[PDB]
Amino acid sequence: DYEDEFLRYLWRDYLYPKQYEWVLIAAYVAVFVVALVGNTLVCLAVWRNHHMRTVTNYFIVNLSLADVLVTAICLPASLLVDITESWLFGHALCKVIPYLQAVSVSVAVLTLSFIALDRWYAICHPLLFKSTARRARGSILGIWAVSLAIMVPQAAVMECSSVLPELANRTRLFSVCDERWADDLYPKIYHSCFFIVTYLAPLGLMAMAYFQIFRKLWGRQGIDCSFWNESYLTGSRDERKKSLLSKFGMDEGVTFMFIGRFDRGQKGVDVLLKAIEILSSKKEFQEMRFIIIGKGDPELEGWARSLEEKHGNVKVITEMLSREFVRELYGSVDFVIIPSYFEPFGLVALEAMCLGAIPIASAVGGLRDIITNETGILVKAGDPGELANAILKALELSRSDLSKFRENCKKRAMSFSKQMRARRKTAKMLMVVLLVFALCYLPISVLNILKRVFGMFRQASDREAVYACFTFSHWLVYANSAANPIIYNFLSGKFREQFKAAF
């Protein structure tokens, strides 16, 4: 009958001294200061400098401000509650602080989502990529609006109660803050939807987005620009060409060069050979030199050697060469032909371009991205005829200086390589941030979903370790706020620079 009543009456002053408290305090103040100075350093770094004012960094600022909010208001309250098992604040703050916590979690997740979306467009759909500062500073406002709108039920249900309800004796030592619902459907529904909205759906979506992003960035680390440059070549280019041609027993002429596996339906050496057969006539053919380098199918090798013994301006190399010598080739020949069928990386285009070799390549895959206007010739893949015509145009261009074209090739290759490297680094950082986020909010979510929907931890002496789980989960949640600036400091060069300069 009056068991809970009487037991509460007897044990109401039984404080149980927790063995590990000073470590919790130390952890909380550590996280507190680190999150504060870290996130403020983020905000300062971005706001002050102009090169930092990027959409990604505007969002990162939004995230940092969210974390600042949480760290300032909710972290100390969470510390006090978790240590003293009591609510030491007003009835108003009992609604406000958990509300601000929910809202800020929302803001954080949505921010990461917009980061992921922005990067997903920039990388996976470059053509549709629209991302001005006006969009960001206006989308952030939408994030805060929705976040401040959909969290009002939690503010509503937050109540500050103490002694067991329906009890005449309102005597108490301490009060506590918790949720008060009517129908038991309401808390289950709201908390399941809270887990879904603030964790499940956006982290799923972002998992997809970063999956596609990393799939698009995979294997694209760029090339060694320190190796692939003309600096290690001696003399003038035309004299290197003259030396090269005379070394193969040929005379001066507009030199084209293929390098790749002799494949049927990949590197397209067959397209090249066919194109040479097309060029076997015409007046222009004698003005051309061809150097076909590679090794693959015996049929294609024979097909090449036949041309090497038919036309005096065609040399075939099935010999194994060194990178230094390949470099020397790229810095000697006039044009390099990449008749690929689906070339996803086009490292030959980059490596050759860095050495002034002008690319004549099939408009497929990576090549399309690398070779733009005023920096190469692009061909419908597969068609030997259009390739031959491209070679003819190359010849008609060779009756001019071509030097600025080559310098354009160099610049394009270098900027492209640097861009893909920067891209890689950025995506890596954002990935790590998302990951650390997920791991940080995982325990509190598994606990909340196990406490508010699928039963609870309310029965008997099944509470002592559960409190410890909850305190740890809370601390972790706040530790994320300290984590992000550190992540930025290890994985973003510009943030490193600004974090150093701030001292």
Residue 331 touches which member of ligand SUV, ligand OLA, none, C-beta under 5-8 Å by kind? none
Could you tell which of ligand OLA, ligand SUV, none binds residue 210, using a CB distance below 5 to 8 A set by kind? ligand OLA
Nearest residue (beta carbon) to ligand OLA: 218
Only segment of 96-104, 107-115, 327-335, 379-387 that touches ligand SUV (CB under 6 A): 96-104
Q: How far is the CB of 167 from ligand SUV (least distance, A)?
A: 25
On the 0-12 / 13-18 / 19+ scale of CB atoms within 10 A, 310 is exposed
Q: Does 410 participate in binding ligand SUV (rule CB under 6 A)?
A: no
Tell which one of 39, 398, 448, 484 touches ligand SUV (CB under 6 A): 448
The nearest distance, CB 451 to ligand SUV, in angstroms, is 8
Give me the amino acid identity at 428: K
Give the nearer residue to ligand SUV in terms of CB position, either 102 or 259.
102
Contact 67, 55 (CB under 8 A): no
Contact call for residue 202 and ligand SUV (CB under 6 A): no
Name which of 151 and 350 has its Cβ closer to ligand SUV: 151
Residues that bind ligand OLA (CB under 6 A): 210-211, 214-215, 218
Q: Decide if residue 63 touches ligand SUV (CB under 6 A).
A: no
CA quadruple 120, 124, 130, 132: dihedral, nearest 10: 50
Binder of ligand SUV out of 101, 417, 484, 498 (CB under 6 A): 101
**Identity (one letter) of the amino acid at 18?**
K
Both tokens assigned to 483: 């984590």
Please report, for residues 128, 212, 235, 318, 411, the alpha-carbon distance to residue 217 in angstroms, rounded to integers and kept in the order given.
18, 9, 38, 32, 21
Question: Do the beta carbons of residue 160 and residue 91 sit within 8 Å?
Answer: yes
CB of 412 to ligand OLA, least distance (A): 25
Contact call for residue 474 and ligand SUV (CB under 6 A) = yes
Contact call for residues 261 and 318 (beta carbons, < 8 A): no
* Binder of residue 77, out of ligand OLA, ligand SUV, none (CB less than 5 to 8 A by kind): ligand SUV
Q: Give the Cα separation of 32 and 325 in Å (integer).
A: 58
Give rounded-to-5 percent helix, strand, coil for the chain: 65, 5, 30
Answer yes or no whether residue 444 interacts with ligand SUV by CB under 6 A.
yes
> Residue 16 — φ and ψ, nearest 5°?
-100, 110
Question: Which positions touch ligand SUV (CB under 6 A)?
Answer: 74, 77-78, 81, 97-98, 101-102, 105, 154, 194, 444-445, 448, 474, 477
